[PDB]
Design a protein around this ligand. Sequence first.
Ligand SMILES: [Zn+2]
Ligand SMILES: [Zn+2]
Length: 338
Amino acid sequence: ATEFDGPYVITPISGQSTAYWICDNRLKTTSIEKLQVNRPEHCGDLPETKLSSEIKQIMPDTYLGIKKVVALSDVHGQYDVLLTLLKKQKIIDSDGNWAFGEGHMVMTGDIFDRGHQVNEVLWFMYQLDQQARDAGGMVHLLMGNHEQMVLGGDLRYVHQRYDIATTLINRPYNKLYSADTEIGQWLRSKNTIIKINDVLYMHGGISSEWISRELTLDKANALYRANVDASKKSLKADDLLNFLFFGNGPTWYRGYFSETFTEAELDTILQHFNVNHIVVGHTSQERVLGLFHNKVIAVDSSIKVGKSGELLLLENNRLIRGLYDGTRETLQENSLNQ
Ligand SMILES: [Zn+2]
Ligand SMILES: [Zn+2]
């Protein structure tokens, strides 16, 4: 079985973009006209996208007064599962397009790796970003540890199938998502940690080291954008970058899932950010669930396994689990845990 994969789009600072397509284990290269990334013939059902003049703008990391939010994470290249979940939960319409109005979606990282439909997910999320903006809503795609790994050249977890693209396009996988690329430029605009209303969102979690380093959302998000292309040596040698990018930092920390982590300790973090909840991915669960009297909501629902997933809905002072079958279960209402 040969592959179909792409497109990989190069976007220079002036002038037309170029798209690279893997079609039946051969490369096709097209010149993009009028921002429309159109697939050549004989190329499967690979995604077609209109390039955006707006969604690569860097957006705020803090938001007030947002009526409805949905959160999910760790798709890990499972496009079919993502699409089914969003369809069943009525986040998208019958054409596959944003249907969430002025709502906000927070996807807390880890589109890349393990799965076989990475570019399908990426281009879908790019289109959804634009569509949400056009509706007056937003998609917040946050950087996870696998975004950071891929962009930085840690390729341990890339599906073997992508060796076709790296051979045919003749560059390593990190350079298929470099700053010269449309997707790479889009990703390099993204935040890592955000606050919406009384909720903090990030991929892994916030450890007490954040507090001792006197970090802020803006300072961290800016350093993440500026240094995702730093060498490992440089990241490791800078004390602060080392914190941010590695095991105890926002995109790797798993302390909220440790059997010794205490709710008291969580309370000090909640207080530090003046939030009531922290929503995290990274550490895979069987379902969207709450921990510590629903002060932490885990939204890695194991989409990576390729069978099902779930989301979290925050609306009307409720926390709601949205199941893969389209049903809903309340986790918390007003402040009362269910
Ligand atoms: Zn993950
Ligand atoms: Zn992760």
